[PDB]
Design a protein around this motif. Structure first.
Motif, short mmCIF file in Angstrom:
data_model
loop_
_atom_site.label_atom_id
_atom_site.label_comp_id
_atom_site.label_asym_id
_atom_site.label_seq_id
_atom_site.Cartn_x
_atom_site.Cartn_y
_atom_site.Cartn_z
N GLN A 48 0.82 -1.21 0.00
CA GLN A 48 0.00 0.00 0.00
C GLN A 48 0.85 1.27 0.00
N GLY A 49 0.19 2.38 -0.30
CA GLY A 49 0.86 3.65 -0.45
C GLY A 49 -0.13 4.79 -0.42
N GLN A 50 0.41 6.00 -0.29
CA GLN A 50 -0.41 7.18 -0.21
C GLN A 50 0.29 8.35 -0.83
N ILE A 70 -1.38 25.06 5.20
CA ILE A 70 -1.75 24.66 6.56
C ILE A 70 -2.62 23.41 6.49
N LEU A 71 -3.56 23.38 5.55
CA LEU A 71 -4.50 22.26 5.48
C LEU A 71 -3.81 20.93 5.18
N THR A 72 -2.79 20.95 4.33
CA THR A 72 -1.98 19.76 4.03
C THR A 72 -1.09 19.35 5.22
N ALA A 73 -0.50 20.30 5.92
CA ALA A 73 0.28 19.93 7.11
C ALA A 73 -0.65 19.22 8.10
N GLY A 80 -0.50 10.36 10.29
CA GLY A 80 0.71 9.86 10.92
C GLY A 80 2.00 10.14 10.18
N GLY A 81 1.97 11.03 9.20
CA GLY A 81 3.15 11.34 8.41
C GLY A 81 3.55 10.28 7.40
N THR A 82 2.59 9.47 6.98
CA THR A 82 2.82 8.36 6.04
C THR A 82 2.88 8.72 4.53
N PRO A 83 2.19 9.75 4.05
CA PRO A 83 2.10 9.97 2.60
C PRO A 83 3.27 10.68 1.94
N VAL A 84 3.45 10.36 0.66
CA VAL A 84 4.31 11.10 -0.24
C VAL A 84 3.62 12.40 -0.66
#
Ligand SMILES: [Ca+2]
Ligand SMILES: [Ca+2]
Ligand SMILES: [Ca+2]
Length: 321
Positions: A48-50, A70-73, A80-84
């Motif tokens: 899996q991936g994001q 801000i909305l993306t942070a 949990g800080g998982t996505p690219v």
């Protein structure tokens, strides 16, 4: 990226300081005045991936851009800080982002939303420029419904209250024609098909009268050395020339430098209004040198561009500067 684009996506639009879900039936359609966030969940090669794509429309304001940051942070941290993470401006979308909408073209409407004016309403007569790149990725960008906006290299869609037209440039590819058809389905109108050079009176009338438009030998050519844009500048202390990739957009023309557009059979030297004399002199020298290693060199000024030049850009606004 080898993923096929068929994973689960969510798309939100920036509305003030919030992100607001977009109608899932309209995924693939965006307002150029706005900024978006796409969370794309996939599975490829066993794992899996994001990805979060932050997409910035070409007329999106600076406050919308700060609010999506801000909305993306916030989203990044919620997950949990998982996505690219990947930032993308309109017209510079990678293949993978283009593939997310199921072979459909990305459609980009005029307008959008703001804190002050709210959601703009769609005009009753609208024109759309449908352009695809070498790789088949297709973009349908709404522009001002004037005859002068047409160009022989692309297909166009024209929707009025009473009628719809699918105009087809001499140079338009099959991918551009297919894309126009898909736009037409989203608009819920049935087209009269129109080839360039045999337009009915009703077509011209609906654009506000017949007029000259964006054409040249190269723009007309079907076969396709596809054109290349370069930024020429001495701002770093010496004169340099680098390529600008992706779709040719009006925002790519740096108003404080000089630009070269090589259409092979011609070279345009576009002169920004705040460019220095030396930037134009050296650009003329470099163009001439590049040509002679294997052709008119036409000088054009910001705000006084001829149709042969402007036809190469995906969307043009005469009151942009
Ligand atoms: Ca906006
Ligand atoms: Ca084309
Ligand atoms: Ca400069």
């Amino acid at each position: 990226m080898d993923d096929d684009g068929t994973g689960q996506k969510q798309i939100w639009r920036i509305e003030g300081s919030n992100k607001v879900p977009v109608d899932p039936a309209t995924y693939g359609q965006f307002y150029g005045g706005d900024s978006y966030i796409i969370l794309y969940n996939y599975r490829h090669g066993g794992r899996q991936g994001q990805i979060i794509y932050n997409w910035q429309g070409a007329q999106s304001t600076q406050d919308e851009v700060a609010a999506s940051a801000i909305l993306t942070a916030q989203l990044d941290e919620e997950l949990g800080g998982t996505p690219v993470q990947s930032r993308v401006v309109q017209g510079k979308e990678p293949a993978h982002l283009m593939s997310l909408f199921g072979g459909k073209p990305m459609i980009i409407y005029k307008g959008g939303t703001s804190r002050e004016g709210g959601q703009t309403a769609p005009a009753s007569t609208r024109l759309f420029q449908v352009r695809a790149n070498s790789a088949g990725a297709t973009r349908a960008v709404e522009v001002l419904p004037k005859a002068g906006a047409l160009n022989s290299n692309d297909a166009f869609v024209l929707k009025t209250p009473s009628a719809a037209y699918l105009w087809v440039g001499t140079g338009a590819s099959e991918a551009e024609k297919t894309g126009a058809q898909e736009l037409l389905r989203v608009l819920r109108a049935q087209p009269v098909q129109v080839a360039e050079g045999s337009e009915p009176d009703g077509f011209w009338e609906a654009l506000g009268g017949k007029a000259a438009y964006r054409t040249s030998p190269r723009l007309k050519d079907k076969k396709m050395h596809p054109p290349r844009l370069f930024a020429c500048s001495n701002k770093i202390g010496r004169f340099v020339i680098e390529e600008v990739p992706g779709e040719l957009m009006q925002e790519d023309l740096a108003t404080d430098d000089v630009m070269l557009l090589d259409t092979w059979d011609q070279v345009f030297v576009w002169v920004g209004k705040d460019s220095q004399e030396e930037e134009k002199t050296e650009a003329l020298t470099s163009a001439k040198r590049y040509i002679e290693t294997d052709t008119p060199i036409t000088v054009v000024k910001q705000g006084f561009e001829p149709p042969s030049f402007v036809g190469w850009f995906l969307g043009w606004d005469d009151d942009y500067w």
